[PDB]
Amino acid sequence: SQYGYVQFKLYKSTSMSSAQKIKVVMTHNGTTVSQTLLLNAYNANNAEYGLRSDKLQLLAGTYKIVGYYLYDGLDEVLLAGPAGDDNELTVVSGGLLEKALTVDAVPHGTVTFKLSKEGISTRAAGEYLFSNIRYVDVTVMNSFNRVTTELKGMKVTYKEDIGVATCDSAVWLPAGTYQVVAYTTYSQSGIKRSELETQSVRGESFTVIDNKLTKDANVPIQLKETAEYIKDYKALKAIWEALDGKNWRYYSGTINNTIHSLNWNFNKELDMWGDQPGVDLDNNGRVTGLSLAGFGAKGRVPDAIGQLTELKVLSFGTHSETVSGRLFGDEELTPDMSEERKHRIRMHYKKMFLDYDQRLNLSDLLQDAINRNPEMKPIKKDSRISLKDTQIGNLTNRITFISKAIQRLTKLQIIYFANSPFTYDNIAVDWEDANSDYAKQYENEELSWSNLKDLTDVELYNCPNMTQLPDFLYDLPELQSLNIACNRGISAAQLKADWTRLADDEDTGPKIQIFYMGYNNLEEFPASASLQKMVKLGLLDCVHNKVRHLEAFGTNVKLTDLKLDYNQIEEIPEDFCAFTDQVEGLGFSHNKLKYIPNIFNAKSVYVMGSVDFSYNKIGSEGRNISCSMDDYKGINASTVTLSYNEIQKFPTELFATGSPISTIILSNNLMTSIPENSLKPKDGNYKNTYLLTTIDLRFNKLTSLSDDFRATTLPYLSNMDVSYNCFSSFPTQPLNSSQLKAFGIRHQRDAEGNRILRQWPTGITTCPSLIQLQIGSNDIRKVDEKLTPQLYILDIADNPNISIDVTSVCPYIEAGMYVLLYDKTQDIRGCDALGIER
Ligand SMILES: [Cl-]
Ligand code: NA
Numbered sequence: 151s152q153y154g155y156v157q158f159k160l161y162k163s164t165s166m167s168s169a170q171k172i173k174v175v176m177t178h179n180g181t182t183v184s185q186t187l188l189l190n191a192y193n194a195n196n197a198e199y200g201l202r203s204d205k206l207q208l209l210a211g212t213y214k215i216v217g218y219y220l221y222d223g224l225d226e227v228l229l230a231g232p233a234g235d236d237n238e239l240t241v242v243s244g245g246l247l248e249k250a251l252t253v254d255a256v257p258h259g260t261v262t263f264k265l266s267k268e269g270i271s272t273r274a275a276g277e278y279l280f281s282n283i284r285y286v287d288v289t290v291m292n293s294f295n296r297v298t299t300e301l302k303g304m305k306v307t308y309k310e311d312i313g314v315a316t317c318d319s320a321v322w323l324p325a326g327t328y329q330v331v332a333y334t335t336y337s338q339s340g341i342k343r344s345e346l347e348t349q350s351v352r353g354e355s356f357t358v359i360d361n362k363l364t365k366d367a368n369v370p371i372q373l374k375e376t377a378e379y380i381k382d383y384k385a386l387k388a389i390w391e392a393l394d395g396k397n398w399r400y401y402s403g404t405i406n407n408t409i410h411s412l413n414w415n416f417n418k419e420l421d422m423w424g425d426q427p428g429v430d431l432d433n434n435g436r437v438t439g440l441s442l443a444g445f446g447a448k449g450r451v452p453d454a455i456g457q458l459t460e461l462k463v464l465s466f467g468t469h470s471e472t473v474s475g476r477l478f479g480d481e482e483l484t485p486d487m488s489e490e491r492k493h494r495i496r497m498h499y500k501k502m503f504l505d506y507d508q509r510l511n512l513s514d515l516l517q518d519a520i521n522r523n524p525e526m527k528p529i530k531k532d533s534r535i536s537l538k539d540t541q542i543g544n545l546t547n548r549i550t551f552i553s554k555a556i557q558r559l560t561k562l563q564i565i566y567f568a569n570s571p572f573t574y575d576n577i578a579v580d581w582e583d584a585n586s587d588y589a590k591q592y593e594n595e596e597l598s599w600s601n602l603k604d605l606t607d608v609e610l611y612n613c614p615n616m617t618q619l620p621d622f623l624y625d626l627p628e629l630q631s632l633n634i635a636c637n638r639g640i641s642a643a644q645l646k647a648d649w650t651r652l653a654d655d656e657d658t659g660p661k662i663q664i665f666y667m668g669y670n671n672l673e674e675f676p677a678s679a680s681l682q683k684m685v686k687l688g689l690l691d692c693v694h695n696k697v698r699h700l701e702a703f704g705t706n707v708k709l710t711d712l713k714l715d716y717n718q719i720e721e722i723p724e725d726f727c728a729f730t731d732q733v734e735g736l737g738f739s740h741n742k743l744k745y746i747p748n749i750f751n752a753k754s755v756y757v758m759g760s761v762d763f764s765y766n767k768i769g770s771e772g773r774n775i776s777c778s779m780d781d782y783k784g785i786n787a788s789t790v791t792l793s794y795n796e797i798q799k800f801p802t803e804l805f806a807t808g809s810p811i812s813t814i815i816l817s818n819n820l821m822t823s824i825p826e827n828s829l830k831p832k833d834g835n836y837k838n839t840y841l842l843t844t845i846d847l848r849f850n851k852l853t854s855l856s857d858d859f860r861a862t863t864l865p866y867l868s869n870m871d872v873s874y875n876c877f878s879s880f881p882t883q884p885l886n887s888s889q890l891k892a893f894g895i896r897h898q899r900d901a902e903g904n905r906i907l908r909q910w911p912t913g914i915t916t917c918p919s920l921i922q923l924q925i926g927s928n929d930i931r932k933v934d935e936k937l938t939p940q941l942y943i944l945d946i947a948d949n950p951n952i953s954i955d956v957t958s959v960c961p962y963i964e965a966g967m968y969v970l971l972y973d974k975t976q977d978i979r980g981c982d983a984l985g986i987e988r
Contacts, residue, residue: 276373456555467568752784
């Protein structure tokens with residue numbers, strides 16, 4: 151009534167039929183017991199060997215088949231069968247189970263082990279007694295094909311301090327030559343089975359023979375302390391098993407010529423467990439780096455991570471994970487980096503999402519002009535990652551918990567968390583399991599965050615369910631770089647509080663150097679008196695927040711980088727901050743700025759690369775600056791971007807203050823003219839006006855310029871674009887420049903949408919440096935000038951009443967040395983190769 155039945159059916163794989171018995175070896179809750187049954191023969195098939203077993207009465211429950219033996223008429227072992235991966239069978243109360251046994255093509259033999267004292271072969275008593283070893287785990291490695299096999303929880307029968315014991319239950323190994331390469335011994339006390347030691351060894355070579363038993367295979371017991379590097383490798387296996395390791399699949403984020411490894415591997419010799427993708431080791435074999443980035447881990451970080459005390463770089467996610475997996479562009483995060491390597495890695499976020507060449511705000515004409523000019527550096531295409539509101543909150547992993555054992559990793563320099571679903575109270579606040587051998591030990595150690603005096607870099611990027619910053623940040627002694635971008639789980643009120651705490655904290659406040667907090671919800675900056683405490687700040691990213699109110703840091707805070715783009719800032723305090731002699735480009739674009747803030751100095755010996763004030767409301771209040779002309783200090787920057795604003799008056803203020811501007815981008819503004827003394831005083835020139843080589847004035851309402859644009863004021867003027875304006879008469883003043891290489895005046899219209907530009911600029915072919923001209927989409931009529939082969943890029947398309955003869959440049963057009971933009975409908979005489987409609 152408590153029992154059921156089993157029968158076995160022999161199946162073929164992918165000779166026999168002399169066998170008439172089977173001894174199936176099974177295990178049911180530590181009862182390694184075998185039973186002999188007879189074979190009944192039926193019709194053979196290409197799937198069935200045609201042999202079925204007698205009913206076997208067993209008590210209802212789950213059983214695991216270890217192996218089986220087949221026997222002929224003479225009752226000799228005709229086959230030593232392995233269980234396979236279909237090792238389990240469950241007997242049912244009053245049921246009849248039929249188990250399919252598939253005969254493996256690979257010949258197997260059987261083995262027994264003999265545990266022996268080695269190294270301390272009758273010497274100074276070891277870490278534990280040989281006697282009272284109750285269970286062992288042995289790893290055997292095939293000496294030819296190098297395949298390892300793990301034989302777990304074998305019962306050690308010790309018959310008699312003294313030291314010679316055996317594993318009486320035989321195991322099934324494929325025929326070949328082996329060596330024991332590792333073991334774990336256990337002591338049993340009641341029901342508690344405890345670890346004695348784990349060692350990497352090389353036991354004496356044994357050989358397995360087909361359908362025969364090899365007796366007493368060498369397991370060389372050391373009776374020593376488990377080495378720290380072996381403890382590390384076992385912790386890695388724990389971490390891997392706790393974070394759904396079997397289901398990891400590394401994503402490199404790029405299709406190149408490398409096919410990266412998908413996962414870690416523990417089906418190899420124990421001594422090799424430190425060789426893993428993402429794991430970095432020291433000369434003694436200890437773990438110094440661990441990166442789970444790219445694998446897609448799921449689970450809780452166990453207390454076992456506390457063992458890896460030589461860990462210097464630790465990473466669970468990255469802002470770059472979906473782009474380049476484990477890498478930051480081309481380089482990796484490694485232990486003990488130089489100041490240069492560390493800085494390159496810290497600047498990765500900036501390069502990936504914030505910086506861009508300010509000359510990408512110029513027209514295609516002006517960019518082309520610069521790119522084909524060897525006297526100027528080429529314009530770097532926008533390689534940044536565009537990030538939409540839907541892309542934010544996308545997880546790279548399902549890591550829901552971080553053990554507080556992280557407090558034991560005192561040599562830790564850099565820690566990265568990103569794209570995880572954990573809550574702020576689950577980030578290194580508690581033990582993953584208070585009853586783990588690790589937590590039971592570390593509870594008795596005085597573990598504190600105050601000991602991570604080497605941890606300078608922390609990343610908490612895009613953690614959606616994080617409602618505030620975790621407490622561990624405020625207890626870090628030497629924090630320098632912090633990234634908390636895309637934590638839209640934190641409210642505007644909560645973020646202001648968290649930043650205030652961070653600044654007010656006597657630990658971190660005066661130590662923070664880099665602060666990335668873009669794509670968040672901040673509406674107001676913390677109180678100035680608190681922001682002033684951030685004495686060592688050098689980088690600040692507040693892009694894509696909802697910032698409507700700024701507070702100053704003061705002029706004692708010297709910033710190298712400042713990115714305030716995409717917010718709702720109306721004014722920047724005159725004392726917001728100061729800047730270093732290392733500034734490349736500052737971002738203030740996409741705001742509601744009414745004025746250019748007086749926070750720069752044109753009298754500064756260091757010249758910044760650029761200031762970006764595009765997409766604001768400058769000039770909407772009547773003047774481009776809020777201070778007096780006498781108080782205005784100018785801007786020490788080569789490029790000034792003021793496109794998409796409400797500028798009605800040309801910013802003379804910049805030139806009058808001797809600003810070393812070489813490119814001025816004033817496109818998409820409301821100017822109707824640039825009268826005389828806009829770029830100069832009445833009887834002279836401003837100190838640095840001669841540096842102005844590029845001018846973008848497209849999409850304005852300009853009807854006139856002045857003699858301010860002649861070589862007497864702009865002698866090195868190279869590129870100018872006045873396309874989409876209201877010129878009815880060509881402004882020839884810029885053509886006075888001997889250095890003018892490109893000029894554009896496309897699509898001139900009046901308010902009433904008429905094509906107001908009809909006259910060709912007669913004499914333009916004499917411009918000594920002019921290469922490109924754009925006069926397309928106007929109403930150009932007759933052209934009497936003989937075109938020069940020197941001005942070899944000409945756009946005259948969309949001029950329907952044009953009458954021009956191109957005979958002079960006709961052989962150059964044919965030789966592919968002249969680019970003419972035109973319509974086959976236009977009256978263009980002199981070149982048959984053009985295909986003009988006759
Ligand atoms: Cl204005
Ligand atoms: Na590695």
